[model samples]
Target: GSASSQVVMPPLVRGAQQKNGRGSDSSESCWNCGRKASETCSGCNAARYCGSFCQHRDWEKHHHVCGQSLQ
Candidate 1:
């Protein structure tokens, strides 16, 4: 014999919760290539990168502050 089970879905996030203001504007460029950056490291928020590859490649030099916080 087989039994059927009911499943519940999680509530969707309504966009009306908060005002949709200007999104993240990355004005800084990738420190490694000098090109426009698309993402910033959440660890330190001091460096920007065009892609994950660029971030990893520059980690050698950026590691000093990759996860450091300012006072």
Candidate 2:
């Protein structure tokens, strides 16, 4: 049986922080395909995707690397 392929959404870009220290809420559109994000990644609180499928697609390209402390 041929299953319909799921359409993947894009990631949301973090909005600028307000002078009051508050940041803009996640956008409904995805950064990749401009579709609505149905889910968010557990690794970082900075991104939102339409689903797990989309999340995986961005994982490698957006891999998180810990920064070393300045000496």
Candidate 3:
């Protein structure tokens, strides 16, 4: 007989730190989606995003210019 197994998974939630970290300005815009970024990446002063998706997209483009700074 095969035994059934169950696994518990953590709930998906946005971290308080991230939510609080968002900038309070409306002028900021996502470098990818052209929408206002809830927060800007602390690394490069440029490239902002409303969420992870736009952030990732901007990263792909902006990274080419600023990736060297990380090292």
Candidate lDDT (C-alpha), each: 0.56, 0.49, 0.50
Candidate 3: how large is its RMSD?
10.6
Residue 8 in candidate 2, Cα distance off native in Å: 18
Worst 10 residues of 2 by lDDT: 62-71
lDDT string for model 1 (1-71, tens) is: 65578322221121221254444343556766868665566566667666666766677787676546773
Work out how many backbone clashes candidate 3 has: 0
What is the overall TM-score of model 1 with all chains considered together? 0.55
Off by over 4 Å in 3: 1-26, 65-71
Candidate 3, 20-48: lDDT as tens digits: 44544346565678765555555544445
lDDT computed for candidate 2: 0.49
Q: What is the TM-score of each candidate against the true structure?
A: 0.55, 0.43, 0.45
- Top lDDT: which candidate number? 1
Per-candidate clashes, comma-separated: 0, 3, 0
Candidate 2 C-alpha error for residue 17, in Å:
16
List of clashing residue pairs for candidate 1: none
Off by over 4 Å in 2: 1-26, 65-71
> Each candidate's root-mean-square deviation in Å?
13.2, 9.5, 10.6
Which tens-of-lDDT digit does each residue in 2-71 have in candidate 2? 6588433344333444675543354666533558654444434456565556666765554542121221
